[PDB]
Amino acid sequence: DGPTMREITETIAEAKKKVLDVTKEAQANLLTAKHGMTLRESFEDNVVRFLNEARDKAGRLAEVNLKDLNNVKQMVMAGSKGSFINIAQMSACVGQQSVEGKRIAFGFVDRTLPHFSKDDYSPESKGFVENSYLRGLTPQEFFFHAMGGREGLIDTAVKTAETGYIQR
Amino acid sequence: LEPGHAADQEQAKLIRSAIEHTTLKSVTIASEIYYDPDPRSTVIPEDEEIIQLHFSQQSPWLLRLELDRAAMNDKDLTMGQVGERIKQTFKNDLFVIWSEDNDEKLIIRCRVVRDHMLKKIENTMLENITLRGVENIERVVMMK
């Protein structure tokens, strides 16, 4: 319903504002890096954690919005298949796209895509998708999701052979 | 940690510092080969203070290392401990003096006792000297 979408959008906006504030604090060297972990890695971990928390909150809001009459929710409760992540991505938010255990790297010169200027660490430019499959994905979000899917496919294709060799 | 000391965070950080591997590379901001014509007089007017406290024979070469105060505070490293470690590693080959921590700028002066091998000696003293910790240790993180 409309109220649920409005609440999800508000939560996403709050998460984006928090990420922007954290980035501004980091730029002014006002953020204390975690012990051992470097400043860049600490900032990336904090941003990823915030985005994951926002996505989880949006998924929880969607799930509570859905009623027992909902078919997807009923199937998930049955335990046949699906999970919280599936409902969240289908109705609330796809979430951050991780490649090699990290956000989308600057493939170009300090630019993830040509559509973004150099030194753009905002979530939208770092693989984050703020639109569920229902509404659709923007071309940048689509490309990031494609990169994530390619990474997953390659990982499966290599790990199947590795596991077979180990089992042998 | 031991059950008695497992409830104290100060003891945990003390143990972490004791076992954490500390090297001059992490703390040393820079190292330069300055020239000191005489021990009594220094080319840098501000450097004289280092020998002033000494007032209150040696080769005409100087090696000046500038460190990071923030790194010292974070790692709890102190000038006295590193000086003692250097003296232990080098009994009398090189004379080393360090400024008091209270000074705004902290530097260390090392000079070979009575130039071609000076670079090699400096490289060995930087890379092959450990202030404290255990070899083959990168970082130690405490957790609850």
Add this chain to the structure above:
Amino acid sequence: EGLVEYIDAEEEESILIAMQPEDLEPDPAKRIRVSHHATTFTHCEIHPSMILGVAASIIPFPDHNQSPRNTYQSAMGKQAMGVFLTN
């Protein structure tokens, strides 16, 4: 006339590209659109959907579908039985 220019991989590193002709230049159902933070946009895409290949373009609403499913559909489309030529 210079209305359309060819750009290679190397040149893309030194240009900013707008998503739509009139979106970046100037009912919560429409997908969220990234704000036009920049103001230069020396170039722009004729249409984003053209990034898709021959098989991918056949997929209806590829964005609405997960990327692995799109890849599977692209692989499977080559095996679909249908009229390949009129002769």
Add this chain to the structure above:
Amino acid sequence: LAINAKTITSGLKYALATGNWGEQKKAMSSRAGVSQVLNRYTYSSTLSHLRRTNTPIGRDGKLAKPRQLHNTHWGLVCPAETPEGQACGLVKNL
């Protein structure tokens, strides 16, 4: 005169027949697979095959980095169209 024309015609025919792209038939490092039988299961399949790209890197190995599509592929290589399996991440379609 006395030019052996077959030397060129037969060589080209062999190169386009088995896909062995080499200076001579005896060569074992000809990097086969350059030429492939055009697929005509459906018109879309033929179009995709005609616009297909191949990577000389061996299909074996477990290095994911080359297989992953770089950000530079935007607008040049289809993000989704790609074979699944050993050839995944190596065979690309523009």
Add this chain to the structure above:
Amino acid sequence: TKFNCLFCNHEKSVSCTLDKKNSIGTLSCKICGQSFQTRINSLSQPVDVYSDWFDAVEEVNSGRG
């Protein structure tokens, strides 16, 4: 420490010793007994000593010393 020789025309009969401390390259053949000495650098190699010996032999033969 194996190189060809020109006096006896025997291959692999030449041995070169490079004393970097004294910076001296000495070339000796185990068949004809010919011995040659030259100045060398830390980057010198036995091929350098062989080339120097060949150049010296050519200069001596030409008589343009």
Add this chain to the structure above:
Amino acid sequence: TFRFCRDCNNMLYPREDKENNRLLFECRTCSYVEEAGSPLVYRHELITNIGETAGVVQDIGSDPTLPRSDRECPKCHSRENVFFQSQQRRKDTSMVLFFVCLSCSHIFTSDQKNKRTQ
């Protein structure tokens, strides 16, 4: 600071004159000798604050790629600026940004606690 002979266009090795107790730059190829202006011989700069602001040119602000910003310039109070990050790439480099003003081509750090000329 490192200089050359200025006559043969060659490097100068350092040497110590104990009789004069001085550091002198001279090349063994020739007889040229000079007295070092400053007592600088060796420097490694394990951590370097220079080189992060490199490549700046007069037409830097005209690059579309550089992201714009509306921060007021300290001197000319010009809102228009182009902001970028540290040029040097490292796993420990700070994320401090640098802003260049088109009107005066002045580079200033985003940090407010300390003001940096470059």
Add this chain to the structure above:
Amino acid sequence: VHRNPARLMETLRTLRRKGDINPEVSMIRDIREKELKIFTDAGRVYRPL
């Protein structure tokens, strides 16, 4: 090397757009490195915009 990279790059772009030079040629100017690269070799993938 060239002293006025901006003017040369603008002239090259204008000529390429007008059609005097083959559009397939790729010209890239990097201010950070202050380097101008021109590529005409075959096998280069390009798209229209």
Add this chain to the structure above:
Amino acid sequence: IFVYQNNITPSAMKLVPSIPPATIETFNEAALVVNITHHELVPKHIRLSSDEKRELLKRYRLKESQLPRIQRADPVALYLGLKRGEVVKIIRKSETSGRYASYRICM
């Protein structure tokens, strides 16, 4: 039992076998600073007599090589000074069973 501070020269190592009837074991000061047996991972090791070894072999019907092997230089073997052909019983605590008794024979 002889304990050294820094290291042992090879001359002493080759001289040690010079006395068959008397067995001499060399230990490092750093190695013995902390007792290994007190560790939780290491189970309880009990030396077995020749008669006990013979009885175990007879009951289980095993040969010398069928029993699990333990390195001569194993820290536990040095701690107990186990000799060649000597069987040691290891009592371990497990989740599946209250305790388990295994045996190991030096190679």
Add this chain to the structure above:
Amino acid sequence: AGRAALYKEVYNVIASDGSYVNYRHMALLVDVMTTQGGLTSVTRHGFNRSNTGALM
């Protein structure tokens, strides 16, 4: 102690994804990898270097 550490690491890696395997299988695996004097890696340089049947 090495066998116990190997078993604990095997259990941790197996349970990382949530999959559960009975303790007996892990115990047998660590025992076979440690039945010899040292730790016999599961490779052509480990158990395959033992004195088992030639055809095996």
Add this chain to the structure above:
Amino acid sequence: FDMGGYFIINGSEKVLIAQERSAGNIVQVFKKAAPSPISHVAEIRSALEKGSRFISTLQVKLYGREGSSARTIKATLPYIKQDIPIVIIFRALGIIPDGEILEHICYDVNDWQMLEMLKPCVEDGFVIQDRETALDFIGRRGTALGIKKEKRIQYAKDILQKEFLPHITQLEGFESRKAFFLGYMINRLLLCALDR
């Protein structure tokens, strides 16, 4: 509807799949694993763009890891197994003065880090001061029953003219372009090593 774009061989329709290759005439700088002594290697696959194409993989390697105290750079000249210091190559080209070599390698004299890193290189290359000596040293390796002083200096000069950076030119009229290109390659390698 048929788009053609294939070859009819023995009736069978064969299509040639596009083959991906690393672009030539470009310097690519890659790091090396810690166990290997090399630190950074810059490679260029020079090849003629008009005819008589042949692969010329020229690689310049910086020996010595971080803190090794040996910051030396050696370029693997084609047909020369033993890597030669860049100083000897510059001397052979014609840039004998050390200052000229440094200026070609480093454009901005203000940056003293590059000069400090290159100091060992010039220190080790100081032995060579003549073009003939540099050519002879280059020709030392890969002996094929020849006399270094007799019809080998010309052979080494021809190799340096053709084998070394064939793409930039194939004539001896202007050999300074090769020196400038080598200096640019070394500058890129040093920039990559310094992490800038």
Add this chain to the structure above:
DNA sequence: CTAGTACCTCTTAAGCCTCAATAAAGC
């Protein structure tokens, strides 16, 4: 003359050899 017939053409695990110090025995 013409056409058969054969004939020359990417990530580790162990093994081994090759290297640079080091304490004892010769003398």
Add this chain to the structure above:
DNA sequence: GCTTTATTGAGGCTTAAGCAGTGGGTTCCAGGTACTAG
């Protein structure tokens, strides 16, 4: 006191390993050359 030893180990090069099963379509019957039988 000086000289020559066996030992120690440390890396380079090398030879190995590289999910399982299944369906199908293409191409090889090899090039020229000399010597000799009908």
